[PDB]
Structure prediction request, 1319 residues.
Amino acid sequence: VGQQYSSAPLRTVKEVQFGLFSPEEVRAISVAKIRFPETMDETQTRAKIGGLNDPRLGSIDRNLKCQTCQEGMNECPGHFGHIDLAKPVFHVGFIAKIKKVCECVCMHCGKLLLDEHNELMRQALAIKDSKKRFAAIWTLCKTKMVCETDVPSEDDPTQLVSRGGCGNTQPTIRKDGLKLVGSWKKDRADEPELRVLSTEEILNIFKHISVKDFTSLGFNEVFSRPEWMILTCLPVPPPPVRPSISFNESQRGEDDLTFKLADILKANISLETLEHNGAPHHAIEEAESLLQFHVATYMDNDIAGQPQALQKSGRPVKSIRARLKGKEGRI
Amino acid sequence: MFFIKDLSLNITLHPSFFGPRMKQYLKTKLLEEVEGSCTGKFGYILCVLDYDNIDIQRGRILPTDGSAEFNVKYRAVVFKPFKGEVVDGTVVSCSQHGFEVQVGPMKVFVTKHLMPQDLTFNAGSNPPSYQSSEDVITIKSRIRVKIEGCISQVSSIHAIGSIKEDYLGAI
Amino acid sequence: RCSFEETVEILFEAGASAELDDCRGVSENVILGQMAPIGTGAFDVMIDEESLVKYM
Amino acid sequence: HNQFECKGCDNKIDIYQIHIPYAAKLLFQELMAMNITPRLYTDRSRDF
Amino acid sequence: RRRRLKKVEEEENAATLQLGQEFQLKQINHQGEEEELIALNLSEARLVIKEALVERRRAFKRSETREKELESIDVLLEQTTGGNNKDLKNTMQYLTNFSRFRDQETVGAVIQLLKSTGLHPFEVAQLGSLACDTADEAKTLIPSLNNKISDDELERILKELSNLETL
Amino acid sequence: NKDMCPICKTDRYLSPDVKFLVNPECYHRICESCVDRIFSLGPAQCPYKGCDKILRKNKFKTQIFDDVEVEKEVDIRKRVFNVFNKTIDDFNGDLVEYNKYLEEVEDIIYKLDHGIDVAKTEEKLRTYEEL
Amino acid sequence: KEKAIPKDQRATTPYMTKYERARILGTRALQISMNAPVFVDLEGETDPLRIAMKELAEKKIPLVIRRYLPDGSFEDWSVEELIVDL
Amino acid sequence: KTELGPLIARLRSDRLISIHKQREYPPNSKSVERVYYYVKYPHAIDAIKWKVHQVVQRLKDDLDKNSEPNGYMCPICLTKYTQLEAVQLLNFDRTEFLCSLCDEPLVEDDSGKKNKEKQDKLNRLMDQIQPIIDSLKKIDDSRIEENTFEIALARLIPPQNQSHAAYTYNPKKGSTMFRPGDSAP
Amino acid sequence: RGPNLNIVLTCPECKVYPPKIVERFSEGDVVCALCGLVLSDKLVDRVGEASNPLLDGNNLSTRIGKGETTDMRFTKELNKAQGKNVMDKKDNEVQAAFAKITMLCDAAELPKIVKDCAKEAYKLCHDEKTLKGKSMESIMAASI
Ligand SMILES: [Zn+2]
Ligand SMILES: [Zn+2]
Ligand SMILES: [Zn+2]
Ligand SMILES: [Zn+2]
Ligand SMILES: [Zn+2]
Ligand SMILES: [Zn+2]
Prediction:
C-alpha cells in the first residue's frame, strides 16, 4: 500500500543543528502531561489517560489510531509527553561539563572569574574553535579562587580599575556520586568548610552567566545554554521508542524505558508529597537523590561507582545510551 | 484584498513529456496546478499574468523518480484575506449557526454571536432567513462583512466575519 | 564521528556545543538515507531543452 | 484533512516531508529523550 | 543567514496595516528590483484579470450593461482557462456584480485621484472598493484612515469617487 | 471614583499603565482596558449603573480639564462655535449688534448644557447650518 | 549566479567519467521504461538499458551534467559534448 | 511535628517565614543542629505584592476571556474547538459543525452568562483586598530594613524559662563559606 | 465513553463487509482473499521485562543493585530512600502476602498452579470489609 499522499513539499536534509532542549520547548512540544506511573487503567482493557502509554503519544498496535493525528501505526511518528520534575536534576551526561563551568564562573554572581584585563585570558579568548577555547579558559580559571572586585589596570599596575565582582572566595569543587560538593578554605585562623552544591543553586548560577560569557565557554545563545544542562522538565519518548511486546499474547511485557519512566514518576510524586508538608530536610535529600539516580540510570545505566538499575529478574536495565552504542546499537 | 504577487513554484514533469514541446506542457501544468488553487501563505491564486513570459529554469532530474523538477517564476493575481478588513459579498447558505457570505473565491462565516442582538433566525420561512425590524438577510442577499478572524492552512483559508459594527450588514 | 566510537559522548558534546553538521560526508547521508555525494552522486543531472528541440 | 501544525512554533504553512530510515527517526527520538535537539533543516546557512 | 527559532511575530491585522511577512509594503520582484506592494481595488482587479484572459485567448488562437458583460466573461472564462476553475468563475462573477468603475478610463481616473494622499496601498485599494458616503463611514470601515487624512480631504475624495460611478 | 475604573475596579497602584478616557455622550470615566473588551466588536450600551445611552469605541477621547462639568460646557461650546461663528467686522463695527449676538450664543450654550429646551435649541443649531 | 562557471573558462575534463556514464545510462534507461520519447532509431530492441546505450553512442541524450566543485561552484556539460572514450 | 510541618512548609514556600539552621554545642550533651524561624520583611512584602497582583490579573484576564465568543466542544471526545477552528469542520450541508475524531455534531460551550458574574467577583475582591493595597502604599513611602537572624534576636521575647535552644548567634571564625540567601543588604 | 480509535481492514474494491482477509505473515502482507488486493504492508511480527497483570495488576518497579563497579555507600542509601515511598507501601502488603504464600506452598511441595490460584484468591478476596477482623493466617490458609 505505502504511506498516504501529503501536500507538504518533499525535501532533502541539508544540515543537522544539534543542541539542548529548553524546559519551555519541552512543554510546548509536549502533547500530554504524564502524571500517572501506570500503563493501563483498572480494567486492563484500554490505556490510562495521563499514564505512560497515553493514547495521545501515538499507537504501536495495528488496530488502534493515534488520538492526536488519527493515523495508523505505520504513519504516526510518535508524539512526546513531558513530566514536570519536582526539583531540578543533573543530566548524567553533562555533570563533568557542568563541573568545569562551575570552576570557571563565580558561584555567587555567575561572572567569569577572569576578565579581558588578564593577558593570558586575552590569548585564550582569541582562540577560534569553541572546544579548545573552553579548555584554555578552564585551565586558567579553575585555579582562580576569588572574584577580584578590583583588578590592576592594563596601562600600568599603579592604580586599580574596578570590575564587576563580589569578593567571595571560590570553593574547590569535586564530584561525589551524582552531587557536586564544594569546600571553602578558612582564613589565617583548621578543617575547611564543606557543603553540597544544590542543583537549584547551580541552576540559579548558570542562569546568571551572561551571553558573551558562555559564548566564550562554547555555548550557543539560541541552541545550547549552560542552564539547559540541568533538567527541570523531562521529555517522555513516545511508545514507538519503548514498544510493549507479547510472548504468548496472553502475557504482556513493557520496555525497560517504561519501567524507568515509571520509577521517575513515582520518585517525583514522592518528592512532591514529602516537601509539600513536613519532610525534614534529610528525607527530602534522600528523595532527591532517588529521583536523580532514576533519571541518570534511565539515560545511562553504566555509571562509575554507582549502583545499577535491575529488573526483578536481576539483569541490568537497558538504558538509552546502551541502545545507541556498540556493534549492535542504533548507529 | 487583491494583490499582484511574484510567486515561485516547483513543477514536476513525468518523463513522458520530455519532448520538443515540453515548455508548453510546463505552462499547461502551471495553469492547471496553480490557477484556482488556495495557499495559506499567499491566499487564493486566481490568475497568472503574462502567460507568455513565464521564466522556466533548467530542470533537475530526480534521482529515483526520473522526473524533472522545474522551478517556475510567474506573476499572478492573488486574493488574500486579512482580519479587520471589510468586504462585500452575497449570502450563499443560511443555518441556525449563522449565514455564509461569498466574497470572491472565499466564504466568510458569520456566527450568531458576531451578529446584532435584534437579528433572529427564522427557520419557518422558506428559504430560512435572519429577520429584524429593519432588514432581512437571506440567500443571495448582499452583506458588508468585517473579517474578524482568519485561519490559514497550507492549502485552505477559512475566515469568520461580523456585522455588529456600524455601517455593516445589509447593503 | 559518532559512527566510529564513543557515539553518545560525541553526541552530547555536539548538543552542548550546538555543532552544525553540513552532511557532506558519506556517513551523514547513510544515516539520513539519501544519495551520498560520491561516485555517481558527485554531480547533478539536469534536462537540456536546447538539445530537446533539435532532436526532432 | 490536508492539515499540518507544529504547536510550539504556531505555524501551519512551513512544513516539509523527508524520507529517512525508520532507525534514523528512532535515533533522533531517542536523542530527544536525552534532552538533545537534532534539528533537521532543508536549506544551508553557511557556505562551503 | 543565521540561526532561527521562535520569535514573537506581529499578528496580522488590517486595522493596524500589519499585513504579515509576504505582503510587506516593500516587495522584491523576480529581477531583484525593489517595488511597492501592488494592491488592487475590485474594479482594478476586474480589469487586470480579464486583460490577461484575452491575451491568453489570443495566444492559443494564433498558435455594456451588467448581464451581457457577465455572460461574455463567463463564455471567455470557460474557453481560456483549464480545469478546476471553480474559484476563478466565482471571482469573475463576484467582481462584475460589485465593481463601481466599468471601463479603463474610469479606473485610470480613480488611480490618478487617490495617489495624491500618499496612503498605504491597502488603504487606497479599500477606498476604491467600498462605497462610503461620509468621512465617518470611511474612518470606521477603514480604521487605519484615522489620523492619516483630515475629514476635509476625505469628504471631497469620497464625493469625487462617487462622481465617476457609471450607472 | 478616585483613581480606579468604576467598572473593573482596576486601581492605579497595581496597574500603573492604567489610562482613562471619556465619551461625550455621557462623560463617564472608563479605563482603556474596559473600552477594548466592551466595545471592540461593535456598539454597546454604556457599562454604567443607570446609563443606557449607546456609544461607539471610536468616539472615546482623553479628558483635558480635571472638572467634568467644564468639559461638557467646552465641548458644547466647540460644537456651537463650529456653527455660530462671526466677528466684529461681520456687523460692520456695530458693537451693539455684535454684543447681542454674543449674548444669544451664550444663551444657546447655557440651554444646551443644562437641557432647558433641547429640542428647539438643537433644531436652531441645525437650521443655522444651512444659512 | 556566481556559482555557474561560464562555458569559456571551464577547467574540468572534457571526458565523461565512469560514474557519469553509469548514471546517465541509468537515468535515461529509467525514463525510457516510463514511456519517454526515444530520439534514436530502434532496429529491434526492448531493454531500456540497450536503448539508452544506442542513444549514448549516437549522442541523442538530452541531458547535461552539473559537475560540482569543492567550493560550491559548478560547471554544466552536455552529454553530447562530453567525450565517451572509456 | 506532623501538624507543624505543613504549616511551616507553606509559610516557607510563600516566604512569609525564613529558616536558620546552626550547629549548637551544649556543654553537657551531644552537639545538635537547631532550627529557628523568623520573618524577613522585604521577602514577605514582595511575595504579598506579587500574589496580590497575580490574583487580580487572573480575574481580570478571566473577565476578558469570558467576554469573548463562546466556542464549541465535542460531547464524545471532550475536545474544545474555537470559533475559528470549528468553521473548517462543518458538513457539506452547512448545517452543523462536525467533530474531526468522532465525526459528530458539536455542542455550544458555556460561559455565555458569566459576563456579569466575573465582574461581580472582581468588584468583591478589590473591596476585600483593600487593606493590603492601603498598607503597601504606606510601606513604599518608607524604607524597610532587611532582617537577619542576629538582627531579629535584638527584639527577642524569651518563650520559656529554660529553653534548650541557645538563642545566640556565634558565627564561626574566619569562615569564608557563604550560604545562599544568608546575607542582607 | 471514549474516542473510538479503531481500525477495521476492508477491501475498498470488493466492498463486501465483513471481508475475507488473509494474513501472509511470511510475505508481511494483509490481502483480500477474493480479489488479491493488499490492504496493509510492512506488518510487524533482552529489551523488556515480563509481568503477569492478574496477580500484580499495573505496577512497574525496578530494583537497585551492584554493578561491575559500585560503592556500597550509594547502594545502601538509595535502597534506604527507595523504601520510604508512600504510594508503593500499599501494594507491598499484597506482595509480602504473596511471598509468605509462596513460602508455605513451597514447603508443602505443591505445584505452581496451586500457588498461582492461591495468590489470585488472596488478591481478589483482599481489601474488603468482610475480612478485616480475621487473622492473616486464616486468610492464607483459606486461600491455599
Ligand atoms: Zn500520532
Ligand atoms: Zn563573584
Ligand atoms: Zn476598567
Ligand atoms: Zn454612560
Ligand atoms: Zn469528538
Ligand atoms: Zn477485495
Observations:
- Chain H touches chain A through 17 residues (CB under 8 Å).
- Residues 10 and 16 of chain H are 9 Å apart (CA to CA).
